[PDB]
From a paper:
The AcCoA ketone analog 1a, in which the thioester sulfur atom is replaced by a methylene group, was tested for its ability to form a hemiacetal analog of the tetrahedral hemithioacetal intermediate stabilized by the external oxyanion hole. Compound 1a was unexpectedly degraded by microbial contamination, yielding a crystal containing an acetylglutamyl anhydride adduct and a CoA analog (modeled as 2a). Despite our expectations, electron density for Glu294A was most consistent with a mixture composed of both free carboxylate and acetylglutamyl anhydride adduct in a 0.4/0.6 ratio, with a relatively narrow range of B-factors. Since density associated with the 3′-phosphate was ambiguous and weak, the large ligand in subunit A was modeled as 2b. The electron density associated with the large ligand in subunit B did not extend beyond carbon atom C3P, so it was modeled as 3′-phosphoadenosine 5′-(O-(N-methyl-R-pantothenamide))pyrophosphate. An active site acetate ligand was also included in subunit B. Subunit A (5e5hA) adopted an open conformation distinctly different from a partially closed conformation observed for an AcCoA-derived acetylglutamyl anhydride (PDB entry 4eu6A). Subunit B (5e5hB) adopted a partially closed conformation similar to that observed for the glutamyl-CoA thioester adduct bound to acetate (PDB entry 4eu6B), even though 1a and truncated derivatives (e.g., 2a and 4a) cannot form thioesters. A more likely explanation for the difference is the absence of an acetylglutamyl anhydride from the AarC•2a crystals; crystals obtained from AarC+1a adopt an intermediate conformation characteristic of other covalent adducts (lower right quadrant) that may protect the labile anhydride. Degradation of an AcCoA analog by unidentified microbial enzymes produced an activated acetyl donor and acetate, which suggests that ester analogs of AcCoA (e.g., 5a) could be used to produce a stabilized acetylglutamyl anhydride on AarC.
Author numbering:
A (entry chain A): 2 to 512
B (entry chain B): 2 to 505
């Protein structure tokens, strides 16, 4: 079937290589793409090539690359390989791009995902030269049907001087109808509109991105796959974490602090999220609802069994197996899923109104329960804050989940002081590791520290943590949040110098 | 003219001492009180005295004290002296209470002010045994008219098992009409209601707090004063700061990034605010609107000079001169001011929708523009995060303002690394000191550093910050946000060891 159903736009179809020539050195480029789904593929590959060729001849060729969130090898990967990106925002998971960022070759700022559209409209990223957006289809009246994510595509389409569309025949035609795109003022000039979402299954818009066809400078016909990350099978650490979390939910229900259907759930991806979604599928709950950033394997399974009734997200993040399953049953799952603009999926007004339960990963937390989601040793970027801030602060309950150690035991995920902070104490109420669960509601910092050390810290590190804390309590400038500034960051430096946070017994250590 | 206009409730009047006896060791007490305005006074004093006596006889006698925000000597002060508060939330400015907190004798957690009502309903502080609320009057229908703040009072009245009302004759009877108390589910069980505020001057509720009269166990007639802000004027440092900000706003308007009337303004608690407001009072921006937590002296003046049209807040924080001024002209000012529940004034959904400009003070910022609002040397509580987070993260523009130094030049307000973080990089776009303004929008952390160091840092400290940053760029573990962890916190330790951040 013909995917470009607007006859007039067919005249703008052309090869990827030619379309990529529309993108000039210094251009700010907004693209589709969120958790490895729905990013443009062929134009970025052709761009990277021409970039490398330019560079080889001593000619500068770099762009500013603003996305929904993370993309995949064909975009972030190819462009970072070509060294073709001078500035990147707001979220990346590609390893080559991460190396450019951590070497200072690509300037990076990881804005809260729900705020990116707003800040783009305010002009923070400068003037948008190009919007580059992947589509399932173009409708009879020139509407752009998105693919496996919505992200910021509508905002980029509004702002950009020129538009390039990739129509990807790999994406299932029955994605059409799954998106909800609102024409209301979510991220524009104040006063903004009330986003009137009062239930997770509510649609407020329509199925297409809107763009003036006169801005469309090229359409490229493509056929290439998203980045479908291998399924991260839960290990015993992930299963233990999930166990403690599910025990906690069951307890809150039995104490009437949560309904039996819990509240709208936001979860991440990976090992632990997968263990939690598997536990929810088997637990004593019913009629669950997702209001998250992403749809993952475990959510599909609950939508299939009827355990989950609806899942709202901005994107899919599926394994190949799960992708195949939803592709063969898009008719059924399309009725269970709403994909929203990320400035709506990550809207704090909505997250709070709905009372979402936030469940997020972390690099580390300190004994007072300040959380680092991004910067290893305080200076090396992992991925970015993403929407963890959007959700942690706005949620009914903010839960952080992590192995108690990293790097094969050589790093403790509970430290004296976090080397960088993404989520302040006030934005984190519950911590879960494979060692147990700390409930910090209503506690002072010293009381948080007693719970976090006793419930969450690994036994190999707990005596060092207790020693730091005990001595801080005796010696800190103030006793409200006790610290020893002489050693607060010394475990990290110890790791930098020696590859482990564990002390050597050839020198003294108070514990 | 009788303040208690419900005849039947007059039979509940009793002595402050007798009322205090309703409050038992271990109780959770929610009170009125926000920025030194509208907190109960007599029952706390009577309680404090009974607490000391009990301690002497060997009887434990402490409470949990949950407020709107800060109170004053009659409440926080007296209970601190008596050592009668085991836990305190969310915001304190009383010196005696601060000393209990920093000595570890009172447990404190400074929640975001807009979230306190919600967490209290959730059960985070435990069950509320008592709500102790100051009132201007009690209407014929049994409505409780608030005094100089709303705070969390509606929520505490809802939650508490027993209610004590102090009716304070000192408070102006013409406060009645000024408050807007919403019927809706703002902070209750999800799903919450949409709060239909789309304009800062929009009233959506009524003038009184609602409470079941069967829950009222005692009404205490009182007569005692709120705290006042000092009467003290902006010095050359604050005026320099206001000058840079006002120039910034001017450039924004000229570039069409702000309207000529700007956007609703949130002005933080502090003295740099006064400079800023005093600057706006005679600035080129007309038809201004406040959507804030508090009505300061500055705001009152603009409401007077017509330069500001309306101000929404949860509370008053006025000098005695300004207090006298508004109490002479309440009929004028009452039409210009709306006092709301703090979970409405500080609602992130509302703040974002209105597109507030947030202007807040700070202890320090690091060179990457993380902000500390609360904890000196990372461990010693000043006041609390208050509503600075609610507004910083939700605002259209998040501005932080500060002298570039503290303690007569012996502390730099710009440091290699903040000893504690309240506001992350993502929540701070603009910094202003008396040295200049740093516009960080669209910038990576190293780019932020270059702006903050060059524009904001004091000349005494700027070469030292540049030295730290340059060696970090060379030697840091990663280069995205360069640090030398062996010296990131060394300026703070140097201050602890020697009394100054300047090397010998
Ligand atoms: C959609 C949800 C909202 N978005 C976000 O929260 C985005 C920010 N969060 C993230 O990027 C991830 O949650 C985190 C923080 C990287 C953790 O991811 P995860 O739960 O898959 O954790 P995992 O144990 O597999 O480790 C992830 C990587 O970080 C590394 N890592 C984790 N903790 C670490 C630590 N304390 N020190 C050093 N490396 C660490 C680990 O070695 C691996 O590489
Ligand atoms: C909205 N609500 C909020 O933002 C709540 C949190 N914020 C606050 O409490 C205040 O904005 C702050 C952060 C305390 C700053 O207040 P302000 O603008 O009045 O600042 P100001 O220049 O007057 O300094 C206020 C006090 O903090 C002290 N201070 C300020 N910066 C400091 C620093 N870097 N190190 C140590 N003390 C510092 C200063 O000495 C003074 O206390 P003392 O007189 O010495 O007892
Ligand atoms: Cl809204
Ligand atoms: Cl809490
Ligand atoms: Cl709302
Ligand atoms: Cl920005």
């Amino acid at each position: 079937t013909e995917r470009i159903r607007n006859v007039a736009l067919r005249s703008k179809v052309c090869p990827a290589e030619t379309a990529s020539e529309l993108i000039k050195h210094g251009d700010v480029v907004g693209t589709s793409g969120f958790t490895g789904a729905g990013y443009p593929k062929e134009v970025p590959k052709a761009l990277a090539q021409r970039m490398e060729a330019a560079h080889d001849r001593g000619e500068k060729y770099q762009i500013s690359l603003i996305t929904g969130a993370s993309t995949g090898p064909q975009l972030d990967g190819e462009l970072a390989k070509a060294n073709g990106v001078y500035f990147r925002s707001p979220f990346n998971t590609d390893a080559t791009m991460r190396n450019r960022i951590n070497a200072g070759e690509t300037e990076y700022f990881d804005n809260h995902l729900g705020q990116v559209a707003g800040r783009a409209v305010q002009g923070n990223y400068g003037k948008f030269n190009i919007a580059l957006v992947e589509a399932t289809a173009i409708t009879e009246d020139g509407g752009i049907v998105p693919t496996s994510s919505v992200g910021n595509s509508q905002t980029f389409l509004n702002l950009a001087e020129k538009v390039i569309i990739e129509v990807n025949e790999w994406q299932n035609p029955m994605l059409e109808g799954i998106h909800d795109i609102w024409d209301g003022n979510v991220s524009g000039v104040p006063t903004r509109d009330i986003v009137p979402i009062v239930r997770a299954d509510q649609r407020v818009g329509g199925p297409v991105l809107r763009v003036n066809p006169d801005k469309i400078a090229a359409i490229v016909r493509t056929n290439d796959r998203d980045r479908n990350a291998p399924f991260a099978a839960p290990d015993e650490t992930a299963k233990a974490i999930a166990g403690y979390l599910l025990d906690f939910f069951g307890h809150e229900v039995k104490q009437n602090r949560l309904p039996p259907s819990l509240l709208p759930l936001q979860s991440g991806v990976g090992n632990v999220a997968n263990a939690v979604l598997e536990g929810l599928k088997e637990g004593p709950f019913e009629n669950l609802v997702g209001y998250s950033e992403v749809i993952q394997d475990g959510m599909l399974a609950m939508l299939d069994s009827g355990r989950m009734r609806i899942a709202s997200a901005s994107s899919f993040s599926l394994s190949p197996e799960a992708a195949e399953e939803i592709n063969n049953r898009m008719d059924f799952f399309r009725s269970k899923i709403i994909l929203r603009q990320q400035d709506v999926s990550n809207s704090p007004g909505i997250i709070r109104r709905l009372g979402c339960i936030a469940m997020n990963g972390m690099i580390e937390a300190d004994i007072y329960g300040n959380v680092n989601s991004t910067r290893v040793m305080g200076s090396k970027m992992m991925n970015g804050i993403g929407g963890s801030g959007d959700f942690a602060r706005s949620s009914y309950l903010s839960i952080f989940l992590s192995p108690s150690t990293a790097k094969g035991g050589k790093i403790s995920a509970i430290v004296p002081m976090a080397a960088h902070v993404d989520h302040i104490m006030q934005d984190a109420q519950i911590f879960v590791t494979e060692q147990g669960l700390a409930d910090l509601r209503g506690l002072s910092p010293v009381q948080r520290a007693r719970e976090i050390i006793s419930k969450c810290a690994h036994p190999d590190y707990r005596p060092m943590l207790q020693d730091y804390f005990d001595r801080a309590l005796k010696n800190s400038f103030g006793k409200h949040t006790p610290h020893l500034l002489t050693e607060a960051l010394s475990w990290h430096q110890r790791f930098i110098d020696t590859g482990t946070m564990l002390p050597s017994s050839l020198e003294h250590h108070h514990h």
